[PDB]
């Protein structure tokens, strides 16, 4: 399932006026604007590969890339991005199907020259996305990566060598991946035939763009190309209340699959569940009555609906009665030593509730164990699952339970007669993490109303201001949300 094949002076073609995208989401009508961004120069020399002899080299990623193709038959499917591309750092895959555009950010181990059979494993998959597919008619794409955000622009124009004329690329995707990218490679589909694609690199430049009456771009001049063009730039020619509005609340976060699980786990082999890319409603599991303990350290109970974190975890146990007091920062007592220990600078919450009606039996559960003998204390958030016999003497055990060779695993005895302090309490611990990456887990955002023909404040999606709102007749482009 891993084939190698390579049986092999690229040409150079002009890019007359190609690769001008929409810098931002603002609707400007009949204006001549000036911009300073990463653009592709005018009359450059783009590289023309026809990798099919067969060879798909790995190319650099200096600041961004402009990629164009003209093959009618669907041969080119997707791209792979990464730093080392060899099973030791995160990598990104955008292979798409006949009706899906699935995107995965995982720890891949790629082949020599992957083709559609590309990778061997996928260890830690930290992202996912599904939507409508991206793909003689020229198709052209622009890829940028800044501040942990991956940005994709694209366009499709029918033609009948790149044409001459002007076409502006509209925004298509913005992802908060967070990985570091410096090399990329394309991948083809083999059941074949010749396939040609064009590659060019972006540079920091300044442009002068022209917005016509309807908000579309129809012309632009590079401000370095000519002594004449430099002159064109200089001449610049060729309270009552407050309403808060916010998008709907859809992507609720899955807290029902942890607090309402059918069967929990032991304490010596506990469970971990990564939670990310969700909207967490922290005030639905506080205003309740089941929980008899909601002890929170590092934050305030009612300030969890205005904060955003990078990551959130969840740990689960079943313990007995008067041991929940040992789950706290700075405790001991044979369950904070050998089973589960909390760091000193904890930032989280601990929630425990009685479950005597589900984990007891007339004879006995005899299913929940705990560690009892160990050589050294546990480091914070460290799990041990082995069952080697604990040697308490000089003579080696040789794996036999005897004189000075204790069995370090004892079972809880549960039955519906013991008093409080011996009945099974289920425990869940929530931990928060924030480091170096864009924050995805966030609380809900409220919305008030819409009053028109009055002098009021407003907070449309974070654009605070004051004035009067009345219906108008202007027509924005679909992706423009600002005005101006």
């Amino acid at each position, epitope marked *: 399932q891993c084939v190698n094949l390579t049986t092999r002076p690229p040409a150079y073609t002009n890019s007359f006026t190609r690769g001008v995208y929409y810098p931002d989401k603002v609707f400007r009508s009949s204006v001549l604007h000036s911009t300073q961004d990463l653009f592709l120069p005018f009359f450059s020399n783009v590289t023309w590969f026809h990798a099919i002899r067969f060879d798909n080299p790995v190319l650099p990623f200096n600041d961004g890339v402009y990629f164009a193709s003209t093959e009618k038959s669907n041969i080119i499917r997707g791209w792979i991005f990464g730093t080392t591309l060899d099973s030791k750092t995160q990598s990104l895959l955008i292979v798409n199907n006949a009706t899906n555009v699935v995107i995965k950010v995982c720890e891949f181990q790629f082949c020599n020259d992957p083709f559609l059979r590309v990778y061997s494993s996928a260890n830690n998959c930290t992202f996912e996305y599904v939507s409508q597919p991206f793909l003689k008619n020229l198709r052209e794409f622009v890829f940028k990566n800044i501040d942990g955000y991956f940005k994709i622009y694209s366009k499709h124009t029918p033609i009948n060598d790149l044409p001459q004329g002007f076409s502006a690329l509209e925004p298509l995707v913005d992802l908060p991946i967070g990985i570091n990218i410096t090399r990329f490679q394309t991948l083809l589909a083999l059941h074949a035939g010749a396939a040609a694609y064009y590659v060019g690199y972006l540079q920091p430049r300044t442009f002068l763009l022209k917005y016509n009456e309807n908000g579309t771009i129809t012309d632009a001049v590079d401000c370095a190309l000519d002594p004449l063009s430099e002159t064109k730039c200089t001449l610049k020619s060729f309270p009552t209340e407050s309403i808060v509005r916010f998008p709907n609340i859809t992507n609720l976060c899955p807290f029902g699959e942890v607090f309402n699980a059918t069967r929990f786990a032991s304490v010596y082999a506990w469970n971990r569940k990564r939670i990310s890319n969700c909207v967490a409603d922290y005030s639905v599991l506080y205003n309740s009555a089941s929980f008899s303990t909601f002890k929170c350290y590092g934050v305030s109970p009612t300030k969890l609906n205005d904060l955003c974190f990078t990551n959130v975890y969840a740990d689960s146990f079943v313990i007995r009665g008067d041991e929940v007091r040992q789950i706290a920062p700075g405790q001991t007592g044979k369950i904070a030593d050998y089973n589960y220990k909390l760091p000193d600078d904890f930032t989280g919450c601990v929630i425990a509730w009685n479950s005597n009606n589900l984990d007891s039996k007339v*004879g*006995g559960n*005899y299913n929940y164990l705990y560690r*009892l003998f160990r050589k050294s204390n546990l480091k914070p958030f460290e799990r041990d699952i082995s069952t080697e016999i604990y040697q308490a*003497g*000089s*003579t080696p055990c040789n794996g*036999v*339970e*005897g*004189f*000075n060779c*204790y*069995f370090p*695993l*004892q*079972s809880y*005895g549960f039955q519906p007669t013991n008093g409080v302090g011996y009945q099974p309490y289920r425990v869940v611990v929530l931990s928060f993490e924030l480091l170096h990456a864009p924050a995805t887990v966030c609380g809900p955002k409220k919305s008030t109303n819409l009053v028109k023909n009055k002098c009021v404040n407003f907070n449309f999606n974070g654009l605070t201001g004051t004035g009067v709102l009345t219906e108008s007749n202007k027509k924005f482009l679909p992706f423009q949300q600002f005005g101006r």
Partner: antibody, heavy 120, light 111 residues
Framework: EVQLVQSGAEVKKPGASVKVSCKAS????????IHWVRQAPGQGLEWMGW????????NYTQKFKGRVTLTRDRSISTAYMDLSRLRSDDTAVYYC???????????????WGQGTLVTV | QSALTQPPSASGSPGQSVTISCTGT?????????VSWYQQHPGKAPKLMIY???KRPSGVPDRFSGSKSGNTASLTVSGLQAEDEADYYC??????????FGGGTKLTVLG
């Protein structure tokens, strides 16, 4: 107070077998190793071997190897001993016991059963 | 394994002391403190008297007292009565995850 109760007398022949039970009440069953002792009618006590009611591991005297087997059942908290090579020199009285230290083995046998008389 | 030996018989005067002995006990640093003594009356179950050579359990008067030295353990009784008419059994460790008993001593008092 802790109570141990054994079953009644049995009479067998040198081809038969025997099983002895031992019911424990008044304490926590699975926190004490249980030892087995024998006494011929007019001689000194002889040790047999032990059992761990938590795990189930056992160990015997090399003399008895191949003929004796020990088992437990925790739901009703009982321990069973099986012997299956009865001879003329196996008529005796059989006892239970109980260790003092909870999760450790040591022959400080403090509370005893009542004795089953097997007159083969 | 090993084999512990103790005298078949002993006797004492009412008010005197007796020193029923034991020997052959495992003599090693790791496993030194493992000796016990039991008493049986005819037609009954035995009783615990001394464990962990000198530790004594509740319910038995301080007259009974154990000791050990070198390779031999020993029992010591005082204030003998007519009640101390019983058979005493030594007990020790025997190496390969196995414990062993002793022959037994009949303690006799005359009146």
């Amino acid at each position: 107070e802790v109570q141990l109760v054994q079953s009644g007398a049995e009479v067998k022949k040198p081809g038969a077998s025997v099983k002895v039970s031992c019911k424990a009440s008044g304490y926590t069953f699975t926190d004490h190793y249980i030892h087995w002792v024998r006494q011929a009618p007019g001689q000194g006590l002889e040790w047999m071997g032990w059992i761990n009611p938590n795990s189930g591991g056992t160990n015997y005297t090399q003399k008895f190897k191949g003929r004796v087997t020990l088992t437990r059942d925790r739901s009703i908290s009982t321990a069973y001993m099986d012997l299956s090579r009865l001879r003329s020199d196996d008529t005796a009285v059989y006892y239970c016991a109980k260790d003092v230290p909870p999760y450790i083995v040591s022959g400080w046998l403090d509370c005893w059963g009542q004795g089953t008389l097997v007159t083969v | 394994q090993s084999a512990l030996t103790q005298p078949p018989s002993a006797s004492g005067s009412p008010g005197q002391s007796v020193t029923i002995s034991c020997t052959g006990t495992r003599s090693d640093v790791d496993g030194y403190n493992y000796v016990s003594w039991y008493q049986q009356h005819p037609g009954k179950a035995p009783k615990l008297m001394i464990y962990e050579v000198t530790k004594r359990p509740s319910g038995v008067p301080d007259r009974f007292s154990g000791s050990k030295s070198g390779n031999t353990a020993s029992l010591t009784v005082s204030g003998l009565q007519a009640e101390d008419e019983a058979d005493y059994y030594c007990s020790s460790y025997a190496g390969i995850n196995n414990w062993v008993f002793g022959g037994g001593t009949k303690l006799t008092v005359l009146g």
